[PDB]
Amino acid sequence: TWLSDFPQAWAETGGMGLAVRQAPLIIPLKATSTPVSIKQYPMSQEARLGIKPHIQRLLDQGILVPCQSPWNTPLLPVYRPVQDLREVNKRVEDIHPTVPNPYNLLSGLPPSHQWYTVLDLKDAFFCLRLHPTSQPLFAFEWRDPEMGISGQLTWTRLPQGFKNSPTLFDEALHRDLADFRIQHPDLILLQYVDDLLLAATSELDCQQGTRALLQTLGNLGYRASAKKAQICQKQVKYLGYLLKEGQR
Template structure:
């Protein structure tokens, strides 16, 4: 076989490679081989009706779904957009295929006249939304045990069309179709849950979740659902293979169809959803990163919101995310005459560079304690959630949140209370009640015990106490940052970069940005073992290294 990177096709040996289902991936001047592992022996164990063939649509045996809209007595009257002849010719076989499969059906009034056309976007605006149960993609992958090393991904084909619509709800999705050959106009309506409907992911997700409750998941196998994509994981390759085959047969019996070409069958690394998942690690797929990096500067506020939506998908992976994208939020609050500047271009390029160098994050383990390092700077709470693996602390997520406007006027030591509480609540979505050790450069619990009513209202004190004091699984530690220096009565100035991990609380110690600057001195209280209230000192040290 001959491989030429610059060539569109590598002809020598290509037919055999395709026949064997082998993918060759060139990465960092190295060739990676990916082999389609669904063997003939495996296929013989799978009911063939689960595969999507294009001849028929899936069909779930379930109660038809009813859709409620606001002001049903007021019809949604939207004129049908004109479709050119060439476009109608291309759509004709698709429309006919959907009618043949029963996904669409002709619609007429009892008197034979046609109904008014309805725009699906207008239907979305008028639909009474149900409580969303679609999993949060930011925290979904945290449920994958880090010791799992074999994965399968099952992609359900045209899953929404497997859910029947109640007859009284079908008229909501009516539209007009003109046959390009005969010129005959006809009203069609959907009999199944339509694609593009804002409630479809939520409604199908609930239906699939209910169906999966009847599936007997093997003890050492984890199944995660995100809308119509299923991820199976386990430690043993054979167990994952058997569980995947069992799940495919179960889905086929329930009336769902699976895309055979998109099936990722028992792989050490899989893509799900938009992430590359492997043992103990998850990272954004190169395609998703490349898509964001290729975006041009947003010309309007609408495009800025789209960009923020894409970046928000990566927020757990971007250190100091809130501070980094702050300029984009500021552009949204500016007047209409404000234009995109060269300075904005530079900030966007720096943001893209951060995206290009995003590290792989560790999958959280509930069997190990979490460490949350928190700091506050310019009214923004920054933090990193880590766990120790092999003696090295690996990041699980980068967290950042803007403090509310009221807390911007507080002293930094009081802001640290709010920052710690905010990021602690954020981290709960990833720790799932596991033991958490919070490390900050401030004695936040001691500050909170002072009940400083000058800055904190009673409601805030109660809120922060519930989060920071009344948590049995929480440990608070004072940690020196790498920018600080420490002095005690027993030692001279020592830069914090030489100090590893939390330090024991001394009788007296001082934090300063640099030796010689204004210092923050903390002393033990006279009546107890806790550190007293921090006091600012204007003294300059002369004794330092």
């Protein structure tokens, strides 16, 4: 049973993740950037009640923390919280787009490797810590009418909605899986941010490779979705494609 032998690797049984080998991320700003404070547009009670449980969970997990920041961006009034970070994105220095587009990424999958395992990492961005000096950039307001917290909250992990999160996560995971690639020269490993494809020449190589990948991911602090996992199959769904016997 894949789930039982790798408890630490699955999001269902290993608790929230944290990439312990990765230094907290520093987010450089453009040379002329100055903090921007966008007022929170009034949010209906319906929306606040819908969002509330999620904010509480994130606070309990330490992913969100109180703060006082010169920066402030809106949470969408219309549940799961979505922060409009466009004004912060505009002020952050650009980085080279290193994530390959799916078409090019899949071009590196040879017909020799037809046994596949597809894993997707749960709450991947939240596994990467944000350095305290960069945390203020992502603050937003949170008020609980019937006695709430300070005023603002911010993320201690790489947040959703930030323009560089996909690239920074893809780069971080590449650094953490570099050794795995070296130890398994005969396996193909495709990475598209939080979506992983492991390809082997035989069902055996795939089983052994998948065990090694799960163990490595778990030890590194990442968590894969056991519910969505596709293990050692000859046909899998990956990045919108149906991979079947070398096709696509």
